[PDB]
Design a protein around this ligand. Sequence first.
Ligand SMILES: O=c1oc2ccccc2c(O)c1[C@@H]1C[C@H](c2ccc(-c3ccc(Br)cc3)cc2)Cc2ccccc21
Length: 380
Amino acid sequence: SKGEELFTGVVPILVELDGDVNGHKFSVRGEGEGDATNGKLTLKFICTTGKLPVPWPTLVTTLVQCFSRYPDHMKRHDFFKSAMPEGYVQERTISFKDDGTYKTRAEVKFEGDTLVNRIELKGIDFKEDGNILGHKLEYNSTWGSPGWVRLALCLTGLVLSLYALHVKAARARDRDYRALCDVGTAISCSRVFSSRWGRGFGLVEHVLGQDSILNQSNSIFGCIFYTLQLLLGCLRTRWASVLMLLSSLVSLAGSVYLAWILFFVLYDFCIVCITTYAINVSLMWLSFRKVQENSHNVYITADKQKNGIKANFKIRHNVEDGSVQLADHYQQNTPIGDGPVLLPDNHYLSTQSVLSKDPNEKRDHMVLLEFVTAAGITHH
Ligand SMILES: O=c1oc2ccccc2c(O)c1[C@@H]1C[C@H](c2ccc(-c3ccc(Br)cc3)cc2)Cc2ccccc21
């Protein structure tokens, strides 16, 4: 498109936002530059009116997708640049799960040589004690609380594993030892932990032999697994999530095997064992949700009725208590001008945002670096 010529260099950016969230009025001004050749944005935003009444992370998506890097084989699908310099109107509804909603209307267009994004934001139905108005979101932390749920699951698993280790040793030292989980008759955790399936899962010896250092009491692996699940729950990185997921998958396989041993080999309804299986299913589901979460591609489709595009996507904001706050985004873009625009095939934008602080800035502010690449259409 002709608009493309406006983005091959470095372009100055002005962002102006007037907002009202549950009657708390505020204004933001941002300035910086966009480098669409590298899909890169660098901006600093200031709350001009005082303290921002919502967390800065919740405004990132509202505060110029014309600066996305569209690979060359996708140049025909870049609506945003094709609508320039005349610009486009961008409207969103952002639904914060179990909380309020933002509605935004922005005009994005060139004024002289500056790409200007002017935005009106209305927020309603937010909870004063919630994560948004209550300022409970992490700004950019790389480590934090694991959350009450993960903590309960992992400490319970760890405590049970430690007790199983203790039980195995005590029963090895006294045939008449009775554990708290020795309920009687057909329920003896002592017998379970003392069986060959209680060491190396009854499998290690058959691959690594019985001498191996990996042929440890199951509860040792349990201690390690629950401790690492909790510690990885303190990390805010993709790789910690993938590790949690893979280890949960292993724990799933092992739990099903051990349950089979319980019911068809040992004939023992081991309540503490079943409890660890339930904890393992819980952690499996948590790591599954985690891996899903925060991928956050912006899914774009053409809206021929408005000569524009629509998009939808999910943002996950880390909460200081270790939980996550979903922000479900619905988006529409319509050209301001009457000249031709590109209507794309289905695709998505992959976005990475880095939030930081200006050590010399005393006003409430956010420094933002952003990298966005178009994808979702195979180059073949
Ligand atoms: O101890 C046991 O003896 C048995 C002998 C016969 C039949 C059943 C069992 C039994 O049900 C287990 C489970 C094994 C569990 C555990 C949980 C997770 C992992 C683990 C997960 C992922 C990765 Br990666 C590595 C290890 C290992 C063990 C730890 C544990 C702790 C207390 C009580 C029971 C158990």
